[PDB]
Amino acid sequence: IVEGSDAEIGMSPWQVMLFRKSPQELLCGASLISDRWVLTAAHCLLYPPWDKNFTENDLLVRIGKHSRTRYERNIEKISMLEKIYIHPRYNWRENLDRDIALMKLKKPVAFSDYIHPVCLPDRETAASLLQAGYKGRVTGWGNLKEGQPSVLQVVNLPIVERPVCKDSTRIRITDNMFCAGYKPDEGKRGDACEGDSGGPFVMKSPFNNRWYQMGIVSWGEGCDRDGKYGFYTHVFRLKKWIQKVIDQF
Amino acid sequence: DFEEIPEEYLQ
Amino acid sequence: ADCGLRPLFEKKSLEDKTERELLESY
Numbered sequence A: 001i002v003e004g005s006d007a008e009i010g011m012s013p014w015q016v017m018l019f020r021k022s023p024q025e026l027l028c029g030a031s032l033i034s035d036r037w038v039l040t041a042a043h044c045l046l047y048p049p050w051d052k053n054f055t056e057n058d059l060l061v062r063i064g065k066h067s068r069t070r071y072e073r074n075i076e077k078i079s080m081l082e083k084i085y086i087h088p089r090y091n092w093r094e095n096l097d098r099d100i101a102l103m104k105l106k107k108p109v110a111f112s113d114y115i116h117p118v119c120l121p122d123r124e125t126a127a128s129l130l131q132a133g134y135k136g137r138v139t140g141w142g143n144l145k146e147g148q149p150s151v152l153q154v155v156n157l158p159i160v161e162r163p164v165c166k167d168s169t170r171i172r173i174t175d176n177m178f179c180a181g182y183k184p185d186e187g188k189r190g191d192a193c194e195g196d197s198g199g200p201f202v203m204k205s206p207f208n209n210r211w212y213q214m215g216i217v218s219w220g221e222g223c224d225r226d227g228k229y230g231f232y233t234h235v236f237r238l239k240k241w242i243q244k245v246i247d248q249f
Numbered sequence B: 001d002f003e004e005i006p007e008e009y010l011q
Numbered sequence C: 001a002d003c004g005l006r007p008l009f010e011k012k013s014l015e016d017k018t019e020r021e022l023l024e025s026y
């Protein structure tokens, strides 16, 4: 996260860290959506242009974390994966369209002050909250500039109008994405960056006071460049696939 | 850089 | 069923430092 702040303890209890077994390193962020399902970005697992293709056994998920590198004894939980599901029509060849993946945990995780699922948006929440100018929140342990933080970082960013997202890039934008960030002339900055991928873009409903995950940190060009924006996977647009995977497996 | 995690998980 | 409600914030009726920024944008 670039131009963000240290998160408070327990501020994002759904934040998950994707951790490589060997070499031991941070791969991506992710989010807890139930006691054994974790949502993340497909490109975190499968991206052939960089010879990236991880399987259930290459990975650990670490839940309830705050420090980036410490083993947070008695606080964090570490889980193994049972199965990984990548969207069938994830487009890694062109534009990272449908950049989304589900991960089923070997065993359900127990909730605590530091570990708690986020909600998935219903059609009406999405309709009401996904609007240009509204702000959402992004979190991650990713790079601080286009170097690495000691604790989880947070930044609030406004949703940007569709026409503006399109005119800022040569990449072909789809309905399964939205962009967010400040305009060059708005004075405030901030963006996700490398390592933040797979993390949640969340919003707090003014109606029921619950936090909903609206997007998944997907891609951008550099980090926090003027006239550029972060792009996020549109979670609701892909909810049918999410729901399908879950009640089948 | 990262603090070692218990060996059982690296399994 | 209990999603999106943080034990250390919503459940105790405490606010985090910047959530107001979100609400004020809506």
Ligand SMILES: N=C(N)NOCCNC(=O)Cc1c(Cl)ccc(NCC(F)(F)c2ccccc2)c1F
Pocket: A043, A047, A094, A095, A096, A171, A191, A192, A193, A194, A195, A196, A197, A217, A218, A219, A220, A221, A222, A223, A224, A229, A230, A231
């Ligand atoms: N919010 C941000 N500042 N970054 O977001 C989090 C960092 N996520 C990534 O690094 C994933 C990623 C990957 Cl795997 C491949 C290319 C790009 N960017 C190059 C491109 F934009 F040209 C592009 C876009 C999509 C397809 C082909 C090429 C990319 F960002």
